Amino acid sequence: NKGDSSFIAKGVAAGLLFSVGLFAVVRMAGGQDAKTMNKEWQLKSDEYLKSKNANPWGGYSQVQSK
Amino acid sequence: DVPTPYACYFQDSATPNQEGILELHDNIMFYLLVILGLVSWMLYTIVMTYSKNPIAYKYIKHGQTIEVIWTIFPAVILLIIAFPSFILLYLCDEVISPAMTIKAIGYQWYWKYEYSDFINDSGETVEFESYVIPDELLEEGQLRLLDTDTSMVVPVDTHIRFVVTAADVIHDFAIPSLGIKVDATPGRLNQVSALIQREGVFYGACSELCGTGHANMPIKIEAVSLPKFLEWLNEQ
Amino acid sequence: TIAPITGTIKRRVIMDIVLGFSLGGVMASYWWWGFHMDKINKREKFYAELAERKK
Amino acid sequence: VHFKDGVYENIPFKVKGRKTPYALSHFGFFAIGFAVPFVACYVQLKKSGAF
Amino acid sequence: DEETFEEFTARYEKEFDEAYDLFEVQRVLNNCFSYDLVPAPAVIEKALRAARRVNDLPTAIRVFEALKYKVENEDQYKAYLDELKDVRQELGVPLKEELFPS
Amino acid sequence: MVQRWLYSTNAKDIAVLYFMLAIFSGMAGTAMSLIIRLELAAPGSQYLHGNSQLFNVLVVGHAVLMIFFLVMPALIGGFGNYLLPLMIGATDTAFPRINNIAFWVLPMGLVCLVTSTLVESGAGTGWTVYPPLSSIQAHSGPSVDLAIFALHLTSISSLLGAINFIVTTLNMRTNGMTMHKLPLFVWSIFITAFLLLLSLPVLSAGITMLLLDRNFNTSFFEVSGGGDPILYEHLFWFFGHPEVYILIIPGFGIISHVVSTYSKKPVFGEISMVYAMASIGLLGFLVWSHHMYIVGLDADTRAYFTSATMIIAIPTGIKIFSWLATIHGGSIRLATPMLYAIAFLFLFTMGGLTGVALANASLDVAFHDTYYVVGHFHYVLSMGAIFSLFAGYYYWSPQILGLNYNEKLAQIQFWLIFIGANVIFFPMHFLGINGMPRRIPDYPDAFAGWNYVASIGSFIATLSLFLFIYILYDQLVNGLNNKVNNKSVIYNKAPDFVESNTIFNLNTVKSSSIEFLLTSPPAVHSFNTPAVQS
Amino acid sequence: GRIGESWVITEGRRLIPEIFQWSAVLSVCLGWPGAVYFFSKARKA
Numbered sequence A: 001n002k003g004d005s006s007f008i009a010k011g012v013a014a015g016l017l018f019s020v021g022l023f024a025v026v027r028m029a030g031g032q033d034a035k036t037m038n039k040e041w042q043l044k045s046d047e048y049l050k051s052k053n054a055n056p057w058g059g060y061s062q063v064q065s066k
Numbered sequence B: 001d002v003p004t005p006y007a008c009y010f011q012d013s014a015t016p017n018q019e020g021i022l023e024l025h026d027n028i029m030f031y032l033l034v035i036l037g038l039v040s041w042m043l044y045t046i047v048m049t050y051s052k053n054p055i056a057y058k059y060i061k062h063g064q065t066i067e068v069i070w071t072i073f074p075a076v077i078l079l080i081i082a083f084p085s086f087i088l089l090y091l092c093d094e095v096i097s098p099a100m101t102i103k104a105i106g107y108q109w110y111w112k113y114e115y116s117d118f119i120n121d122s123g124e125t126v127e128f129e130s131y132v133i134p135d136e137l138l139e140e141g142q143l144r145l146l147d148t149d150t151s152m153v154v155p156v157d158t159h160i161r162f163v164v165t166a167a168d169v170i171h172d173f174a175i176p177s178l179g180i181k182v183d184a185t186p187g188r189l190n191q192v193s194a195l196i197q198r199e200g201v202f203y204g205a206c207s208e209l210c211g212t213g214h215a216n217m218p219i220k221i222e223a224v225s226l227p228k229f230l231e232w233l234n235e236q
Numbered sequence C: 001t002i003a004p005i006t007g008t009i010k011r012r013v014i015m016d017i018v019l020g021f022s023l024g025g026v027m028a029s030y031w032w033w034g035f036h037m038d039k040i041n042k043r044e045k046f047y048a049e050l051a052e053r054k055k
Numbered sequence D: 001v002h003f004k005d006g007v008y009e010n011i012p013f014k015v016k017g018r019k020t021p022y023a024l025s026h027f028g029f030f031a032i033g034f035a036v037p038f039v040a041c042y043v044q045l046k047k048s049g050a051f
Numbered sequence E: 001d002e003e004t005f006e007e008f009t010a011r012y013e014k015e016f017d018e019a020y021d022l023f024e025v026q027r028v029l030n031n032c033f034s035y036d037l038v039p040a041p042a043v044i045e046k047a048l049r050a051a052r053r054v055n056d057l058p059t060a061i062r063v064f065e066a067l068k069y070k071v072e073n074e075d076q077y078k079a080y081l082d083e084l085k086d087v088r089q090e091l092g093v094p095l096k097e098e099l100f101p102s
Numbered sequence F: 001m002v003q004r005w006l007y008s009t010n011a012k013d014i015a016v017l018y019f020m021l022a023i024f025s026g027m028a029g030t031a032m033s034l035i036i037r038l039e040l041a042a043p044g045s046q047y048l049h050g051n052s053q054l055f056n057v058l059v060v061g062h063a064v065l066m067i068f069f070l071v072m073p074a075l076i077g078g079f080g081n082y083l084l085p086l087m088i089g090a091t092d093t094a095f096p097r098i099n100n101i102a103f104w105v106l107p108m109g110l111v112c113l114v115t116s117t118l119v120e121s122g123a124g125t126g127w128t129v130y131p132p133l134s135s136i137q138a139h140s141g142p143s144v145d146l147a148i149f150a151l152h153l154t155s156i157s158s159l160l161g162a163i164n165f166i167v168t169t170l171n172m173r174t175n176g177m178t179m180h181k182l183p184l185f186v187w188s189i190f191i192t193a194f195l196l197l198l199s200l201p202v203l204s205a206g207i208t209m210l211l212l213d214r215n216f217n218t219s220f221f222e223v224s225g226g227g228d229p230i231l232y233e234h235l236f237w238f239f240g241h242p243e244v245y246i247l248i249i250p251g252f253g254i255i256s257h258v259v260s261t262y263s264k265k266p267v268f269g270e271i272s273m274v275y276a277m278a279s280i281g282l283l284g285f286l287v288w289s290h291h292m293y294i295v296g297l298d299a300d301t302r303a304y305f306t307s308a309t310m311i312i313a314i315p316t317g318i319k320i321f322s323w324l325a326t327i328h329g330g331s332i333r334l335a336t337p338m339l340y341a342i343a344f345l346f347l348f349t350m351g352g353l354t355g356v357a358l359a360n361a362s363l364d365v366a367f368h369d370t371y372y373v374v375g376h377f378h379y380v381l382s383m384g385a386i387f388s389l390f391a392g393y394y395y396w397s398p399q400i401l402g403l404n405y406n407e408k409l410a411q412i413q414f415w416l417i418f419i420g421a422n423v424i425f426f427p428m429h430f431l432g433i434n435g436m437p438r439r440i441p442d443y444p445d446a447f448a449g450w451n452y453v454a455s456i457g458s459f460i461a462t463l464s465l466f467l468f469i470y471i472l473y474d475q476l477v478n479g480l481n482n483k484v485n486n487k488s489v490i491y492n493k494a495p496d497f498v499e500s501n502t503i504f505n506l507n508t509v510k511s512s513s514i515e516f517l518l519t520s521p522p523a524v525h526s527f528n529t530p531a532v533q534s
Numbered sequence G: 001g002r003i004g005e006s007w008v009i010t011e012g013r014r015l016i017p018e019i020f021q022w023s024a025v026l027s028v029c030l031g032w033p034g035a036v037y038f039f040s041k042a043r044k045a
């Protein structure tokens, strides 16, 4: 019926929002971060890999954290 | 040599066998993209035009020309990529004139390496065990679940034969950047060959569910120069 | 008098199939000559400079 | 054997004319299915001494 | 099925003359517009004279509506409305655009 | 009431019990895949406190429930037992008491697998159960025994049901219906019944021999007595591959009916569809060692299995082009069953094209125990067989039940699972090509990126399943009202262009199979005077 | 002869808009992970 496609698009976008916000609540009961998941630790990893000439044409950097 | 965050491609290659594996992957994906381009286009332009067709063509039920043609076309494509896929299969199985052999044995959550060519100045068997460094003992900058307390040292530009077996259950000797993957079965010895073209450190892992410690059994390999390998060998 | 009108849907399945092969044939052409050939030439430059360092 | 015909007659469970709401049966049945993996985890984490 | 266009008209002309109620005139008309061709003007004329004989005006209106869906251009629709001029005028059949003008 | 559902000899009542058990089991197997994806969200111990045995236990439970307790009792035990006798005019099945024991062994096989995870430490072996990891030295206690007895009870179920399906099709057709006149869904249950009959007995030899090593001092696979672990893999995989086709072909026959109904066109080249289904069922017995490409077989053995695996792409591609030929030039009606069928054609093609790469033995060296493989078989099993199971329920349940469902609620459900399934499994190929092994609870830190993305999509798809559970509730409480208001679709075929509204009321149904001509809930005595066709 | 405009012009007017709508759909189905990496810490710092 007229007005049904708009109800469908609104229901899909409301289902995406609820599941994503529920994931972030269950994450808050998870365990602590690993001790190596920091930018300070990840920049000494790159120090070791640049000496050993790691990945000489596609990149070796391990930096993905804050 | 090492995996990287958000990577969507092969790790860089160090051997001619992994050079050829990548060449066959890319050759096949050329033709899988033509086929996906056709099927997704026909699907899209059929829904968009015949969802608004009020009179169906109910008297079209067969066609001799198209049905023969679309039975032959997938056979030609399948035959085109089988030619280089057969050549690569027999080029990697051959192990001709190697200069050294190394044995690797899998255990309940560690590896073990043996050199028995008796080239060192005192003519013994060089052997040691390799263990993952535990999380509590890591030094800052070392790589979690990858770095080991001892590693395997090999020279560059040398043909090497690997001999792989196991002691208790099935394991798997695997290093992505070298093009190596082979099961390690209690009772039999398999072999593989390699020839490394540059120096560096190459990381791998066990690839045959072996129990609770299946994730804590990594492989680390260092490739050095020939005078540097003889000095390391003659000491350890 | 009106000449017969026939084969409208027969000749628009020929153009769909031709279009599908052309569209999928430009996605595959970029993958080879744009992406794959790009990584091959970087690799071949690392090695060809490595031999010169060996002199 | 002769059975009855109709709408709510070819299923083993009662939906209408019942005292308790049918929602307690419908969602209670699918809740117990979703809950057996968590009972297993509880027993095994209480064996390892984690709890 | 190897039927030439000339055999197509001569067979559906025979099929519109034998239809004896509304179900038959609508069923024969449905199958005539379901091929990969536009029926000739002499077939459309017999379909209008078959709906007159069962006394049904909406079926005669829908005949020209299907005609404007099946043609390839709007100048093919016009050339039909210029051939069947007398018959649409003699039986009193309006066009759907003329009946519900926008 | 007691004797209608515990003493049953009616094939329609038994098919309802199958579907009830099948859907109760997909709850448990989805809950296990959610616990698995939460522990894989980030590096480190997350929710299981570092118990790696427990993580491995939940992976076995996940695979066994999805395959042997959801997809087989629903596609075959459910739809096969309900629609096959009605589509050929049969008054029952042959052997009605055999038909009843093949259901009641599945509840007993569930109280064997569940009690297997609660005893000692469970079975942390993988769904393939390779020795020596699964022998008494590396897995002590009664957990692996209780899992083998569970698999034995599902084999009795599927074998007994297959013998019943084969006799009924060959012996109880109605007047005028010859084997060339069968509906395509009847052909798909008939061919599947033959693959089960010739592959299940080889699996029962393999896992009974594994039970003998553990408890009776036997050396089929023990290396100290001369046995060989590689023998078990030959025996297990000789049943395995035929199984994956035992899971897709019934869905091939469902897709044929749905696509033809919502196009108003008959299936293009209907006779070559049966020939293709038979060729795929025959070539599925000659390809099993593509699952053993790296265990040390000969190079000439590996070159045979490469070419044998590739040529199953020819008959399957005939079925793909045939389905696109029937919707071309159609009059498409986009109800909910039609949405799943169009997504099946796009998502099954993708999963099957990643299998063609895996078929070459040279390339499988970089594709062994790699997430890349996990990405292949969740595209053809979860966006494949699962999507055809949704298409079936929305197609036949209003007739079977007499109750309509909320249409616009069902299109929200379809889009939530289409979006969420793609988010879980598409990045799995990126992890595998970069080299991430499978069956690990923990990984190096460079794999954190795509593993976080996939764990989010796992919440999207579980929410879509909970919406389906509500749609079932709404259909069972408000099904009669869904017919008088405008909240549901009444006719899956609309009037033709020149067909008037009142002429359409003379024949509402234009069907090429019997099932849409019965009363809405079909009568318990469906045929007295046999149906007749020309 | 033939009445009206050429069949090339009539078919051209119908397909050109659909080519662009096809390439904008397949890019979303295959390129959506490229957007996740765009807003990541690992990318371009």
Ligand code: HEA
Residues within 6 Å of the ligand: F023, F025, F026, F027, F030, F033, F036, F037, F059, F060, F062, F063, F066, F067, F071, F074, F126, F127, F128, F374, F378, F381, F382, F386, F389, F390, F393, F421, F424, F438, F439, F440, F458, F461, F462, F465
């Ligand atoms: C039937 C087959 C099936 C199905 C449906 C699924 C569904 C899913 N699977 Fe799994 N999976 C396997 C079969 C299946 N899987 C197998 C064989 C393995 C390998 C085991 C091994 O490694 O030993 C495996 C392994 C596997 C792993 C590997 C773990 C590791 O290696 O240790 C992961 C990881 O995330 C995973 C995830 C998922 C997810 C997220 C879904 C979810 O996306 C599901 C998405 C959709 C749904 C929520 C399901 C629909 C719900 C229903 C109840 C249907 C009802 C329908 C009607 C009745 C009409 N699966």
Ligand code: HEA
Residues within 6 Å of the ligand: B035, B039, B073, B074, B075, B077, B078, F244, F245, F247, F248, F290, F291, F309, F310, F312, F313, F314, F316, F317, F318, F320, F348, F349, F351, F352, F353, F355, F356, F358, F359, F360, F364, F367, F368, F369, F373, F376, F377, F380, F381, F384, F385
């Ligand atoms: C529904 C289940 C299902 C289906 C249908 C398939 C179908 C196929 N599978 Fe798969 N597979 C599994 C379920 C399935 N598989 C599971 C569960 C595993 C892992 C088991 C485990 O380890 O636990 C697995 C693993 C697996 C392996 C083992 C890899 C490994 O473990 O290392 C291989 C090897 O070749 C394989 C290949 C194929 C091929 C070639 C098809 C072919 O049938 C696909 C053919 C289809 C198409 C090709 C698409 C359409 C075709 C065209 C449009 C024609 C035009 C095409 C060309 C010209 C190329 N898959």
Ligand SMILES: CCCCCCCCCCCCCCCC(=O)OC[C@H](COP(=O)([O-])OCC[N+](C)(C)C)OC(=O)CCCCCCCCCCCCCCC
Residues within 6 Å of the ligand: A016, A018, A020, A021, A022, A023, A024, A025, A027, A028, A029, A030, A031, A032, A033
């Ligand atoms: C148009 C294109 C498509 C459009 C695209 C649409 C989709 C776009 C998706 C982008 C959103 C992705 C966000 C990912 C979720 C997230 O980042 O959570 C942040 C943190 C948890 O994230 P974490 O890093 O994994 O937590 C670490 C675990 N510790 C160490 C804490 C134990 O969470 C926290 O701890 C702090 C936040 C606490 C939760 C409050 C936030 C709001 C939730 C409210 C709850 C509402 C619903 C729950 C009802 C009960």
Ligand SMILES: CCCCCCCCCCCCCCCC(=O)OC[C@H](COP(=O)(O)OCCN)OC(=O)CCCCCCCCCCCCCCC
Residues within 6 Å of the ligand: A001, A002, A003, A004, A005, A006, A008, A009, A012, B040, B041, B043, B044, F334, F339, F342, F343, F346, F415, F419, G022, G025, G026, G028, G029
């Ligand atoms: C696809 C890329 C993104 C996917 C993920 C996001 C999905 C979008 C979120 C949900 C959209 C809601 C829209 C409302 C419904 C609507 O649009 O209805 C508008 C039309 C008709 O309704 P109407 O307008 O005539 O009347 C409105 C009266 N109220 O229905 C459709 O056309 C449905 C389209 C069917 C598509 C079939 C399944 C598609 C997946 C197959 C893969 C496609 C091929 C890929 C290769 C090209």
Ligand SMILES: CCCCCCCCCCCCCCCC(=O)OC[C@H](COP(=O)(O)OCCN)OC(=O)CCCCCCCCCCCCCCC
Residues within 6 Å of the ligand: A059, B004, B005, B006, B007, B008, B009, B032, B033, B036, F350, F351, F353, F354, F426, F429, F430, F433, G030, G031, G033, G034, G037
């Ligand atoms: C259904 C299964 C499909 C199979 C697909 C498996 C993968 C095949 C290999 C694809 C290579 C991707 C190019 C890498 C680009 C890159 O360089 O990535 C760059 C970044 C991060 O890169 P970075 O920062 O780490 O380093 C390098 C920095 N330059 O990522 C991304 O932008 C993610 C974007 C996703 C790419 C879209 C993939 C489209 C391929 C469609 C395949 C169709 C299947 C065919 C039929 C089966």
Ligand SMILES: CCCCCCCCCCCCCCCC(=O)OC[C@H](COP(=O)(O)OCCN)OC(=O)CCCCCCCCCCCCCCC
Residues within 6 Å of the ligand: D011, D012, D013, D014, D015, D018, D019, D020, D024, D025, D026, D029, F015, F016, F019, F020, F078, F079, F082, F397, F400, F401, F472
């Ligand atoms: C707990 C309540 C007890 C109340 C106390 C009694 C007081 C009076 C209250 C009156 C209620 C009487 C209670 C009797 C039990 C009862 O009616 O519902 C209780 C029943 C349980 O019983 P069961 O017979 O189904 O067996 C099962 C016991 N293990 O739940 C249910 O199955 C809910 C199941 C609904 C989900 C199935 C959905 C499938 C729909 C069919 C579609 C088929 C498609 C087929 C295609 C092939």
Ligand SMILES: CCCCCCCCCCCCCCCC(=O)OC[C@H](COP(=O)(O)OCCN)OC(=O)CCCCCCCCCCCCCCC
Residues within 6 Å of the ligand: F094, F095, F096, F097, F098, F099, F156, F159
């Ligand atoms: C663990 C140790 C292994 C035990 C094996 C499992 C035991 C389960 C069955 C127990 C036997 C009870 C008798 C039921 C059989 C019966 O009665 O067959 C008799 C049926 C009765 O037909 P009807 O009454 O349905 O129709 C009513 C008509 N008067 O005739 C037929 O069908 C004809 C075909 C005979 C085929 C029988 C097959 C034998 C069943 C066992 C198959 C096990 C396969 C797995 C092998 C390991």
Ligand SMILES: CCCCCCCCCCCCCCCC(=O)OC[C@H](COP(=O)(O)OCCN)OC(=O)CCCCCCCCCCCCCCC
Residues within 6 Å of the ligand: A064, F418, F419, F422, F423, F452, F453, F456, F457, G027, G028, G029, G031, G032, G033, G034, G035, G036, G037, G038, G039, G040, G041, G042
């Ligand atoms: C066919 C189906 C298609 C569906 C489309 C997908 C959309 C559904 C929702 C997807 C979930 C997003 C996962 C985010 C995980 C996360 O947390 O992202 C983290 C990253 C940062 O990285 P970080 O290292 O700082 O993380 C730190 C961890 N704590 O922030 C983001 O990038 C924000 C997300 C970007 C939004 C893109 C969403 C995709 C839409 C595609 C639109 C079309 C693009 C076309 C390009 C050609």
Ligand code: CUA
Residues within 6 Å of the ligand: B106, B109, B170, B171, B172, B206, B207, B208, B209, B210, B211, B213, B214, B215, B217
């Ligand atoms: Cu050794 Cu896994």
Ligand SMILES: [Ca+2]
Residues within 6 Å of the ligand: F039, F040, F041, F042, F043, F044, F045, F046, F441, F442, F443
């Ligand atoms: Ca973890």
Ligand SMILES: [Cu+2]
Residues within 6 Å of the ligand: F240, F241, F244, F288, F290, F291
């Ligand atoms: Cu297989």
Ligand SMILES: [Mg+2]
Residues within 6 Å of the ligand: B207, B208, F369
């Ligand atoms: Mg393996």
